[PDB]
Design a protein around this ligand. Structure first.
Ligand SMILES: Nc1ncnc2c([C@@H]3O[C@H](CO)[C@@H](O)[C@H]3O)n[nH]c12
Ligand SMILES: Nc1ncnc2c([C@@H]3O[C@H](CO)[C@@H](O)[C@H]3O)n[nH]c12
Ligand SMILES: Nc1ncnc2c([C@@H]3O[C@H](CO)[C@@H](O)[C@H]3O)n[nH]c12
Ligand SMILES: Nc1ncnc2c([C@@H]3O[C@H](CO)[C@@H](O)[C@H]3O)n[nH]c12
Ligand SMILES: Nc1ncnc2c([C@@H]3O[C@H](CO)[C@@H](O)[C@H]3O)n[nH]c12
Ligand SMILES: Nc1ncnc2c([C@@H]3O[C@H](CO)[C@@H](O)[C@H]3O)n[nH]c12
Lengths: 233, 233, 233, 233, 233, 233
C-alpha cells in the first residue's frame, strides 16, 4: 500500500520477474502464466501474480531509468516481501562479442549515474548481481540450449547519449551493451539484502548499426522470457 | 518513428502539457479537453491531443525520473516539433513557506543527478525554465486568482532519499520542494532550444509530515491543471 | 563595521545597486544620484548613498570574482541589512543571439567554481535570481523601450579561459555570455534569504571578437544603469 | 622482459597464481609444485613456474595496493600473455556473514581509488571477475568440500583506514571484507581482455577484532591454495 | 595595456611586490619607496614603481580571491614581463604553532577552489613557490633576526567559511593559516614559468579568537614588509 | 610490531632512509653502512640499522605505489618513532630542464590518486616536504658539489599511463618527472607531524625516450645515495 503499488500486502509471490514495459508485463502474464491476476496498476504500471508449471510467480513493470526502477524495486522488497528479483529487457550492444538477439547476463552494471556515489560514500560501488541467481541462470540456459553471453552492461541516465565516442572504450572493458536500469536494480538489492540478477536481449547494435525490425522485437525475446520463467520454477 | 512514441507526425500540437502519470494525463483529457484523441500509447505511456476553448493542445506522460523524463521530452522536441512544454506534477514540500495544495513555479531546479555535469563539461549547469513562459504563468495565475509560490525545487534521483538530514539546508537556499524530473526537463529544453516550465502542487510536506487524503490528491490539483491550460490559450 | 566595509549601519539604503568597478560606481553616483555621499572606502572599494527621483538608493563595488563578490554581498546583507541587490556589469558574449551593447538579464548563472558544491552538499545548486526582481526588470524595460535579452550566463573563475573550446556548447545551452560573479551573488542571496538580480551588458563578443572602443565603454552602459535605477524607484 | 620482471619469453604458463607476498609465493612453490623454478626476482618480487599433478602453472608476487598489482598484472598479460589470473590473498572481514578462515570469492570489487575513474570516463566502473573462472571456483569448491563465501570486497588505498565508521554501510551493501588489490586486478584484466578471479581468506575480523595465530597465518590458507591450484589443473 | 592595468609596457620592474589591498600598496610606497610613481589605476587597483634603497622595484594590488589574484599576476607576467612576484598579506591562523603577528612562508598552498583541477586535468595540483625565493626568504629573515614560520596555507574561496569544523584537521596537516590567494598565485606562476612566493602575517587567530588591534594592523606588518623588500635584490 | 615490519621497537633510528626496492636498500646497507644489521624482512621488504660516518641510521623499503608507501611510512612513525624520513628513488623525466641521472628534489608532489581528497575534505591538499629537510638537502648538495634539480613531481597510480598526452601540460606546470610515491609519503608525514623529503634520480626520459643501461642502474645513483647519507649526519 505504497504510493506506486496498490496491491494488497501478501499479493506478491517472493519471486518477481521485472521488465520495464507494463504492456510487455501483461503479455507475459497472458501468454505464460496460469490464472494470472492483475494485482497492481498505479500509473498504468501493471503487476501480476500467477503460476508457471505450478510454481507461484509475480511480474512487475518498473519503467525506464535508475530512479524509476529504484522506486519499484525498493517498494517490492520493503513492503511486499519480495526476495528474488529477475529483470529482463532490451539493450543496445556495443561489443563485437555479441550480436542481435543474444541474451546477456549482467555480472556487473557500470554507470554514469551519481546515485551509487550518493549511496556509497562518494566511492566506487561495484554493483553486481546475486551469484546464486547467476548460477541458476547459467545452468538453466545450458539446460535449454541457450548460448548465454556473460559480462558487464553499462547503465546510463541517457537513452540519447552524449558519449557515443566512448562506446569502444566501454566495449574494451567488457561492457557488452547499454541499458538504463541494472545498476540501480543491483544497488537497491544490495542495500536491502535481496537477491537480484539482470538479463537483457540485444535488440539494436549501436556500433554495427544492425537494428532488428518492429515485430522481431515482439517475438525475438520469448527465448529470454522462457529462460527467466524456467529459472524460477 | 520513435521507440517510445507511436504517434503520427503532426498528431501533437506545438504546445504540450506534461505529467508523469499517464492516468492523470488520461484524467485531464477526459475532464478538460474537447474532441480528445489518444495519439500514442507505447509502454502504456499515454498521450492525447484535444482542444481547450477551441485551441488545440496536446498532453503526454513522461514517467518518473530525470532519465525517463529526458527520453520523452527529447523525442517530443526533436521529432514531434513540440515548441512549448508545460510540465505539471506533485512534490514534497520542504520549506515552511509552502503548505499542502500550494502551486510552485520552479525558476530553478537543483539536482543530485550527474546528467547535467555530463551534458555540461563537468561544471554546474543552472537548470532554469524559459523566462517568457514563467512570465505568462505568473500573469495567468493572477488572471485566475491563484497565489503562485515561486522558488527553486530540488530534482532528486531518489524518491526514498538517503539525505533527509539535508532538507533544511535545501530550503534555506530557497528550495520549496523536492520532485524528480524538473532538472532534466529544463536541461533538455535548454539543449534543444525549446521553451519549458515546471509547476508542481504540494501533496505532501516532508517536514511537518502533513499529507493530502487520497480523495484530495485526485481532485485538489484541478486548479494547477486549469492554470496550465489557461496559459496555453 | 566589517573588515571590508567602512560604513555604519544605516548608511546603506535597503536597495543596493552593485558593480565590479569602484570607479564605475563613482561614475553612477556623480551622474545619477542627487545628494551623492560616499559611505565606505576600504581597499579603495567605494560605496555610495544618495537619491534617485526621490528614492534613496545605495551603490557598492564588489570587485572581480565569486569569492570577492561573495564577501561584499554577505556583509551588505548580514551587517548592513541590505535587502535588494541589483548587480550590473559587463560580460563577454558567446551566443549568436546577442551583440554589443545588448543588456542581458541573467535568469540563471552556471559556473565552473566549486563554491556552490561546497555550499550545497556536493550536488548541483541551480543559482537563480529573485523572480519578483526579474519581473520588475522586464516590466521596467518594456516601459522604457529597452530590448532586454534574457537567458543564462556562465560565471567563471577564469577571465583568461583554459576552455574556450567549450563556448559553443555553453551557448547551445542558452548561456548568452560569460562573466565572473553572478553565480556567487545568486547563491549568497539564496543562502541569506535576499532578493538579487544580475544584469550585464555585452562589452566584448568572445566569438566574433567584436569589442567596444575604450570610449564607447563610457556611455553605452547608461541605459542599463537607468534600467537598474528605474526599477529601484 | 619488463622493468619489474626479468623472466624470459614464454617462461610463464598461461595460467598464473597471484599473491601479494613474494615469500608466500615461494611457500607455494616449495610446498605444492614439482619441478618448480624461479623465473623472476626483480625487487625481490619472486615469480615461479612448475607443475601440479602434471599441469604447468606459474606463480607471481604483486606487492601491496592497486597501483603495485596493476604493474604486475599488466606486464603478465601484455609481455608474458598470461590468460587466466587467479589471485589469492588475505582480507579484513567487515561482515557478520563471514568469520576467520572463511574463503571469499569476490564477485565485485568496490574501491576508493580514482584509478577506475581515470580508466573509465570518470564514471562508475563495476569491476568484476570473469564469470567462467568464478563458476569454476564454485564447482571446484563444491567438489573439494569447501564452503565458498561469495560477494563483494572493497579494495582500498588505505590499510589504515580513515573511514572505519563507514564499514557497516559497506557490509550492508554486501561487502564481505576489505583488501587492497582486487579492484585493480579486475579492471586491468577487463582492460586487456584477460580472465581474472580474486579469492581471499579472512585472516582478521575488523568488527570483532578476532585475528588468527601467526602459525595459522602460515598453514590455514592451504585450503585456499589448493582450491586455486585445483581449478587450474 | 591589459584590460585591468593601464600602465605602459615597461613601467614594471622585473621584481614586483603584491598585496591584496591597494591602499596597503600605497602605504608601502609612501613608507618605503624613494622616487615612487603610481603607474596603474584601473578599477582603483594601484601599481607603483619606485626604488627601494636605490633598487628599482614594483608594487601591485591583486584584490581578494583566487580569480582576482589570477587576473593580476597573469597580466603582470604575460604583458609586463614580471619575473619575480612576492606576495604578502594577512591570514587567519589555525595552528597553535603560530600566534598573532607571526610571519608565515607558504611553501604549499592547498585550496577548496576548482581552478587547479580545471588547470590540471581534474587531478591534484600541488601549488608551490619557486624554491630559489623560499630560500632567499629564509636567509634574508635569518639575517634580519625575523623568526620565520614555515608551512602550508589553505587558500579558500570563502572568507566567511562554511567548514570551520575542519580547521583542526587542516591544522593537523601543517596548514598554519587560511587566506584566499596563495593557491591561485603559485598555480599561475607555475603555468607561466615565473618565480613566486607568498608571505602572510597572522593578523587574526581563528581558534583562540585573539586579534590584533586597529593600530597593530597598521604598524605590525612592517617587519614582513621589510623582509619582502630586502629580499628583492 | 606491526603486520608489515619485523623489527622490535628500538631497532629503528629516528632518521630513516627509504627506497622502493628492497634489493637497493640491501645494496645501500652493504656498500655504505658500517655495523649494518637487518632489522625487518616481512614480505621480503628489508630494513636495516647501521652507522654512517659516526651517526646511527636506518633504511626501509616501501614497495611501489602510494598505498604501499603509505603503509610502511605510517608504521615507521607510529610504532618505531622515526622522525626524519628521506626517500630516494627513480623517476621518469617529462621536462626538458632535466636529463638522465639528474637528481631532483620535489618541492611538491601532485597526484592522480584520490588518497589526499579522502584525507582532506575532498579538497586539494598541496603535498609538500618539510622545508628544513629540503634546506639541508640543498646545503649538503652544494657542499658536495652535487647539482640539484628542484621542482614538482607527479605521483601517479599508473606506471603505464593512460594520459601520456598530458605530459607536456604537467611539465609546463613545473613537474620535472613522474614517480609513484612522493605525494603519499608527503601526506602521511604531514598527517603525523614527521619530517619528510623526496629525491628522485632521472633514470628514463619519457619524452626523448633516452634511458640508462642496466649497469648505470646499479651504479649511477651513487651520488644521490651519498647526498642522502651526508645530510642525515
Ligand atoms: N541503446 C539502447 N538500445 C536498446 N535498448 C535500450 C535500453 C533499454 O530499453 C529502454 C529504452 O527504450 C530502457 O528502459 C532500457 O532498459 N536502454 N538503452 C537502450
Ligand atoms: N516526496 C514526494 N512527494 C510528492 N511527490 C513527489 C514526487 C513526484 O511524484 C513522482 C513520484 O511519486 C515523481 O515523478 C515526482 O515528480 N517526487 N517526490 C515526491
Ligand atoms: N570576456 C569578458 N568580457 C567582458 N567582460 C567580462 C567580465 C566581467 O568584467 C570583469 C573583468 O573584466 C568581471 O568581473 C566580469 O564582471 N568577465 N569576463 C568578461
Ligand atoms: N584489514 C586487512 N586485514 C587483512 N588483510 C588485509 C589486506 C590484504 O593484505 C595486504 C595488507 O598487508 C593487502 O595487500 C591486502 O591484500 N588489506 N587490508 C587488510
Ligand atoms: N580569517 C582571515 N583572517 C585574516 N585575514 C584573512 C585573509 C586575507 O585578507 C584578505 C581579505 O580578508 C584575503 O584576500 C586574504 O589575503 N583571508 N582570510 C583571512
Ligand atoms: N616512468 C617512470 N620511469 C622511471 N621510474 C618510475 C617510477 C618509479 O620507479 C618505480 C616504478 O618502477 C616506482 O616506485 C616509482 O618510484 N615510477 N614511474 C617511473
Amino acid at each position: 500500500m505504497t504510493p506506486h503499488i496498490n496491491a494488497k500486502i501478501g499479493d506478491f509471490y517472493p519471486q518477481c520477474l521485472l521488465c520495464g514495459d507494463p504492456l510487455r508485463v501483461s503479455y507475459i502474464a497472458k501468454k505464460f502464466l496460469q490464472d494470472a491476476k492483475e494485482i497492481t496498476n498505479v500509473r498504468n504500471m501493471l503487476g501480476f501474480s500467477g503460476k508457471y508449471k505450478g510454481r507461484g510467480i509475480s511480474l512487475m513493470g518498473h519503467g525506464m531509468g535508475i530512479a524509476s526502477c529504484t522506486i519499484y524495486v525498493t517498494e517490492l522488497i520493503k513492503t511486499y516481501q519480495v526476495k528474488e528479483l529477475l529483470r529482463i529487457g532490451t539493450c543496445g550492444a556495443i561489443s563485437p562479442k555479441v550480436g542481435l538477439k543474444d541474451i546477456i547476463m549482467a555480472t556487473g552494471a557500470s554507470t554514469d549515474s551519481k546515485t551509487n556515489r550518493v549511496r556509497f560514500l562518494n566511492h566506487d560501488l561495484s554493483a553486481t548481481p546475486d551469484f546464486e541467481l547467476s548460477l541458476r541462470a547459467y545452468q538453466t540456459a545450458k539446460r535449454l540450449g541457450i548460448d548465454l553471453k556473460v559480462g558487464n552492461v553499462f547503465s546510463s541516465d541517457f537513452f540519447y547519449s552524449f558519449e557515443t565516442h566512448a562506446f569502444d572504450l566501454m566495449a574494451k572493458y567488457n561492457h557488452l551493451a547499454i541499458e538504463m536500469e541494472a545498476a540501480g536494480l543491483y544497488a537497491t538489492a544490495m542495500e536491502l539484502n535481496a537477491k537480484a540478477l539482470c538479463l537483457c536481449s540485444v535488440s539494436d547494435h549501436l556500433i554495427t548499426k544492425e537494428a532488428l525490425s518492429p515485430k522481431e522485437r515482439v517475438e525475438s525475446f520469448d527465448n529470454m522470457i522462457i529462460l527467466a520463467l524456467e529459472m524460477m520454477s
